[PDB]
Amino acid sequence: TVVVTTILESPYVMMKKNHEMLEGNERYEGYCVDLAAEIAKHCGFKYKLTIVGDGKYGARDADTKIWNGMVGELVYGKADIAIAPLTITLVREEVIDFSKPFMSLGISIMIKKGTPIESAEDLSKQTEIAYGTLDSGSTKEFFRRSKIAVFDKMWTYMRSAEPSVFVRTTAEGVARVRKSKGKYAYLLESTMNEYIEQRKPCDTMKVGGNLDSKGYGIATPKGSSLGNAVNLAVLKLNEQGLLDKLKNKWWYDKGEC
Ligand SMILES: O=c1[nH]c2cc3no[n+]([O-])c3cc2[nH]c1=O
Predict the structure, then answer these.
(1) Are residues 249 and 156 in the same domain?
(2) Ligand 1 centroid to residue 79 C-alpha, Å
(3) What is the whole-number distance in angstroms between the Cα of residue 170 and the centre of ligand 1?
(4) Which of 91, 102, 169, 171 has the most CB atoms around it within 10 Å of its CB?
(5) 162 and 131 in one domain?
(6) Which CATH number does the domain housing residue 158 bear?
(7) Total domains in the fold of the chain
């Protein structure tokens, strides 16, 4: 039985309402729950879903150099594969292998409906509406390291805006957009931004083109006997139209807006 690490992040993995009456994999539902079943079928393995102990994706402490999250669970042997919306990045790929992406995404803008902002350039050319990102992570780093004039102007503003425009969690970023009466715009992954829009009170919108391009991938340890098959399975499901189908199902068929 393959041990699958994953993360409770909607709509990827969520507890079914009647989870206490159930056990094992049946306790969960979501895009990644459906994906794990397809990947297992196509690779021929039995598996057990487990939620990542510390509830994190995967980052390496700059001082201690220890890996936390799902990446940590793979490099320290606690799980055999990670099936979740784990972004394919250079630092992670140095230590684990990623399948080809199963979903595309990029940095985007979340506004409270009615905010007169349509792009990153709009935001950079004004100060009435504050804007920020998660206070740690790649989105913040994107701006910090960018050489593009608009993005550098945005970084300059954000780094010294008061009150602080950075938030501790994704949920706080969403709540701040919702409760700031149009005076705060949040930068985050387009997939989450698209998902919010679609969730009641239906008061947020995704605007502008993505500012970068990335992808989520299934992760396995270096030398894993699972890597090759998992990678072919993702390509097959994309070509059969199944990945698009799952995305449409969890974002729109189950949408409320
Ligand atoms: O560092 C990460 N950060 C992530 C933040 C996310 N917010 O909404 N979804 O879905 C997310 C997926 C993420 N995946 C990552 O690997």
Answers:
(1) no
(2) 19
(3) 9
(4) 102
(5) yes
(6) 3.40.190.10
(7) 2
